[PDB]
From Swiss-Prot, chains A, B:
The chain holds residues 782 to 976 of 1171 of the full protein. This is Pyruvate:ferredoxin oxidoreductase. Mg(2+) binds at residue 186. Belongs to the pyruvate:ferredoxin/flavodoxin oxidoreductase family. Thiamine diphosphate binds at residues 33, 56, 186-188. [4Fe-4S] cluster 3 binds at residues 28, 31, 56. Homodimer. Catalyzes the oxidative decarboxylation of pyruvate to acetyl-CoA and carbon dioxide. The two electrons that are generated as a result of pyruvate decarboxylation are used in the reduction of low potential ferredoxins, which provide reducing equivalents for central metabolism. Also catalyzes the reverse reaction, i.e. the synthesis of pyruvate from acetyl-CoA and carbon dioxide. Appears to function physiologically in both directions. The oxidation of pyruvate by PFOR is required to connect glycolysis and the Wood-Ljungdahl pathway of reductive acetogenesis.
């Protein structure tokens, strides 16, 4: 079973107690690429999206039908996508625009929830999230309180107030701030995708 | 008529006594672009090839049926070409490869001319050109001596020796070293063509 430990994730020993979310890929024995991505998944894999350029990182990272990126016990893990060899930077840039747009729709539904007859504990977590929606730790902190209070709050609501809470529940996957990562080889970064 | 003067071309006064090879373009009144290219034509227009990106410099520089680039009294002037907006640097890079290839074919025909029964004055200019074929001034100096001696040399030759001199006459336009210039706007250089 999982064991909650307070080892500092900023150290080598503390980081390896986190579950790896990149495992058993098709890279060569002793590859110099996969250890880097594996460490990133152990630190921020809970909330990251990957835009991967075509290359080795896309061949051992995304050759059908096997996917080396996995999830933790909570079912959360990095979402992985590879478009083309030359557009990987702009591909990931587009994701950052969209993810910000999805969080903006949620913040609007949360601000409207403040004006609705909902529980005082629910209003407390919403105000805390709006102030730290762009902070990785704070958005996870107040977001989880919102996720925990939503099912009981929806049961106690009705009419258009219930629809407002149901719209927040539909977008609760954008409470936690995401981390966009654009991964590629030197051939992509130094040549075809440098522009 | 043309007046040979020994004013230093490196000064402003000396450069303007050279004939401009960019005249009467379609640029705006007081454009900040055309004065730059005009000065380049007055210095090296005798032996330059232009790879121009799409933009203002291609619209006032190459809108049919009027061409603003002209020639001097000797009939020599810049050759101008525009491929696309995004490839102008590689377009001009390809020209530099080809021009070097054309000079290489000429140097082979000149080295073979040293082994042929030709005039002593012709052999003197060929040895001088081979040593300075990559120097702008020296290649023009010894090249013009070769161009001046060729018609009399061809008249005095026969057989395969005459064919060797006729092959040099076919390539005499690559004695003088060329100057490849890649002209474009900031939109080309900073964005789409920066890679
Ligand atoms: C537009 C385009 N050009 C070329 C290719 C072929 N291609 C696939 S991967 C690759 C190079 C990978 O080198 P690098 O970016 O350094 O990644 P690495 O494999 O070294 O990790 C190339 C040229 C392609 N798929 N698409
Ligand atoms: C592939 C492509 N994209 C866009 C264009 C349209 N286009 C023509 S000129 C130009 C911009 C010119 O700006 P700049 O490079 O700064 O030159 P300037 O006109 O300022 O001298 C653009 C976007 C094109 N012709 N081709
Ligand atoms: S980068 Fe590619 S080829 Fe090189 S060791 Fe890793 S998997 Fe093998
Ligand atoms: S750059 Fe183009 S638009 Fe600007 S002054 Fe020159 S010709 Fe006119």
């Amino acid at each position: 079973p999982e064991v909650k430990v307070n080892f500092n994730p900023a150290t080598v020993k503390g980081s390896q107690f986190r579950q790896p979310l990149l495992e058993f890929s098709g890279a060569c024995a002793g590859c110099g690429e996969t250890p880097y991505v594996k460490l990133v998944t152990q630190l921020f894999g809970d909330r990251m999206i990957i835009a991967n350029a075509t290359g080795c990182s896309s061949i051992w990272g995304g050759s059908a039908p096997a996917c080396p990126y996995t999830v933790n016990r909570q079912g959360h893990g990095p979402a992985w996508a590879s478009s083309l060899f030359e557009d990987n930077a702009e591909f990931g840039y587009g994701m950052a625009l969209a993810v910000a747009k999805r969080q903006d729709e949620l913040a609007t539904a949360i601000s409207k929830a403040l004006e609705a007859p909902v529980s005082a504990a629910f209003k407390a977590a919403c105000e805390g999230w709006l102030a730290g929606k762009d902070d990785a730790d704070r958005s996870r902190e107040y977001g989880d309180r919102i996720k925990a209070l939503l099912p009981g709050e929806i049961s106690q609501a009705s009419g258009e107030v219930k629809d407002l809470l149901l719209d927040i529940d539909r977008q609760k996957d954008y409470l936690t701030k995401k981390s966009i990562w654009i991964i590629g080889g030197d051939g992509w970064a130094y040549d075809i995708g440098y522009g």
